[PDB]
Design a protein around this ligand. Sequence first.
Ligand SMILES: [Ca+2]
Ligand SMILES: [Ca+2]
Lengths: 5, 432
Amino acid sequence: PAXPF
Amino acid sequence: AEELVLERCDLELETNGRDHHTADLCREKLVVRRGQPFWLTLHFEGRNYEASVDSLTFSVVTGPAPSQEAGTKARFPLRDWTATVVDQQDCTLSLQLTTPANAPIGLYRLSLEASTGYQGSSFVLGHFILLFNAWCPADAVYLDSEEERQEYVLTQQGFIYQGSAKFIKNIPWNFGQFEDGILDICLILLDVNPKFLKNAGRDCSRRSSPVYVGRVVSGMVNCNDDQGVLLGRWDNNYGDGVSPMSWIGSVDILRRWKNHGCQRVKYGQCWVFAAVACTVLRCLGIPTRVVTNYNSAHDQNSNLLIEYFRNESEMIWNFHCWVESWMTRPDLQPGYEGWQALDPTPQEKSEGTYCCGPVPVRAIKEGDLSTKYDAPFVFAEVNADVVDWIQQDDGSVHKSINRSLIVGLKISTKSVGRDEREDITHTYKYPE
Ligand SMILES: [Ca+2]
Ligand SMILES: [Ca+2]
């Protein structure tokens, strides 16, 4: 998945 | 002389498909690319065409309100829309037709009017679908490299980069643009877009432009605001749908959307939206590629800074994906032709809807942020400064540039004609 830092 | 009677019109699928690079699309219906000649053969039931006696006129129409002024209707005699005789044998007449390189794309109905000096008789010859033509020098989507046309229009399998700047990964992806029924679905997608629903005749005319089509697709690939394809979800709970990570290609998604009456498909994330957009655009004939940006920033207040608030906040993403599409930009000052960034993932509204682009990648690199569409947003994704607002024990807040996490790293797309990664960071931003 796309993950927000 | 008695009037002509048409037996049938042969759309010459095998020959047209090969010549027009549409062979996979031409299994059952004629699909051609604008600006280029194609063949038809008429079969007559009594006598054949006689030039001294018969006058034949062709008519083409697309969409629900065609008109010559809008380019969605044309009338032309057998002598930019043209028809000419190429051969005559027994009961058959071999014709060549040409379309303008700026004709609206889509489904046309072709008709024939025949006369010998009295009443005309009308025949429907059939339908054809007209697509963008990257092989044609006069087409806006012209791309002057055969190996690039193969990659960016004709190849149905690629790779999408994921992971993080430190740990790059990829997955294979089946774009599948020439699989059975997909083109039909692409036209459905255009035909249910809000601009069509509002003014069908105008929308159909505006489909002459790859800019307009590109913008439409960026909006229609997400279900937000419209009847679009995918619902995004990011919280790791996908039990009532398909996990974003389960998909291996676009075709299952587009079929699911169609099969349930243009209902949103659960679920996608960035690379899923980008990949489906790539399928649709390659299908329609616009050269397109999927790009991945690492440390991809989401600027929420258009100030080109990514602001974090810390103790004694906007987000940056491990990666983000969007697409680039190849075309001229006659709607801009000269010089901005080439790759245009289009982004179907919902992040920021553009004029009230969740669409984004097309924006010349060149405009991003040169910092020409007034260039339409959505240049500030895309600039910030690849070139924003990260600022920490750090609260001090004394109650003040110290603003500092954070240089540990750099926005916009290792921008990547699959290499032309090979299973390798091309770094294209240099196209979005100058080195410092
Ligand atoms: Ca939408
Ligand atoms: Ca900001």
